[PDB]
């Protein structure tokens, strides 16, 4: 589904610096690619990183990855493959979690992502992620998890 951005919602530079797990997205990528995590860097107001997952095909590979901004919006870029490739919109920004949404090759009606700070969100987090998601006209039970990650026994 298509969000309703925040009106003047800012993405103050610097925010996305560090690791972050790559965990629950509408639609479920899950069974495309998993174990997703992301490590940025600041350039200015952009970013350069890496991105790692587990490929059905490759196993563990690495990604580097260019960010740039341009108010709540940035360009994601992958070096060495372009299917999430995209202009995406920051929807949320939180100490332990941030949303964005854009429409790459891979899922080009929409897809939100939500990155987290913890491999697995306690459950304060998760519902602070809810509520974030019902401000912007998204809804929780319509994302799915990474299910390769193990957060229970
Ligand atoms: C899920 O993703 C995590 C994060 O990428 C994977 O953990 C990483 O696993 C690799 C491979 O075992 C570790 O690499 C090793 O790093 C050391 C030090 O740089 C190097 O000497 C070794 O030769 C190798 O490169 C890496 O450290 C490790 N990171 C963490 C934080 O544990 C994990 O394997 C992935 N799991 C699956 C099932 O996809
Ligand atoms: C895309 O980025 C990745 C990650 O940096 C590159 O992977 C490295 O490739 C070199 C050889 O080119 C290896 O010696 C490194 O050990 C690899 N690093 C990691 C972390 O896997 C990859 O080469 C890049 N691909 C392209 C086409 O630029
Ligand atoms: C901001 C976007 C975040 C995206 C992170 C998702 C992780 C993507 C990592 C690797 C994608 C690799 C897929 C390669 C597809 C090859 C196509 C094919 O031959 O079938
Ligand atoms: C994703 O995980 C959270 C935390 O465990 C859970 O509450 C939620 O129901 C999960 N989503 C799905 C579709 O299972």
Same mark, same amino acid.
Request: proline share 7%; net charge neutral; glycine share 6%.
């Given at each position: #589904?298509?969000?309703?951005?925040?009106?003047?919602?800012? =993405?103050?530079?610097? $925010?996305?610096?560090?690791?972050? /797990? =790559?965990?629950?997205?509408?639609?479920? @990528? &899950? #069974?495309?690619?998993?174990? @997703?995590?992301?490590?940025?860097?600041?350039?200015?107001?952009?970013?350069?990183?890496?991105?790692?997952?587990?490929?059905?095909?490759?196993?563990?590979?690495?990604?580097?990855?260019? =960010?740039?901004?341009?108010?709540?919006?940035?360009? &994601? /870029?992958?070096?060495?493959?372009?299917?999430?490739?995209?202009? /995406?919109? @920051?929807? $949320?920004?939180?100490?332990?979690?941030?949303? &964005? /949404?854009?429409?790459?090759?891979? $899922?080009?009606?929409?897809?939100?992502?939500?990155?987290?700070?913890?491999?697995?969100?306690?459950?304060?987090? @998760?519902?602070?992620?809810?509520? $974030?998601?019902?401000?912007?006209?998204?809804?929780?039970?319509? &994302?799915?998890?990474?299910?390769?990650?193990?957060?229970?026994?």
């Amino acid at each position: #589904k298509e969000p309703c951005p925040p009106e003047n919602l800012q =993405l103050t530079p610097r $925010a996305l610096v560090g690791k972050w /797990y =790559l965990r629950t997205t509408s639609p479920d @990528i &899950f #069974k495309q690619v998993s174990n @997703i995590t992301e490590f940025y860097s600041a350039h200015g107001n952009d970013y350069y990183g890496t991105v790692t997952d587990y490929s059905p095909e490759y196993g563990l590979e690495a990604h580097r990855v260019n =960010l740039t901004v341009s108010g709540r919006t940035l360009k &994601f /870029y992958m070096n060495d493959t372009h299917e999430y490739d995209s202009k /995406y919109e @920051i929807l $949320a920004v939180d100490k332990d979690y941030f949303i &964005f /949404y854009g429409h790459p090759p891979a $899922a080009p009606s929409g897809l939100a992502l939500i990155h987290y700070r913890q491999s697995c969100p306690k459950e304060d987090v @998760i519902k602070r992620v809810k509520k $974030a998601l019902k401000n912007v006209c998204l809804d929780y039970k319509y &994302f799915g998890n990474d299910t390769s990650v193990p957060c229970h026994y």
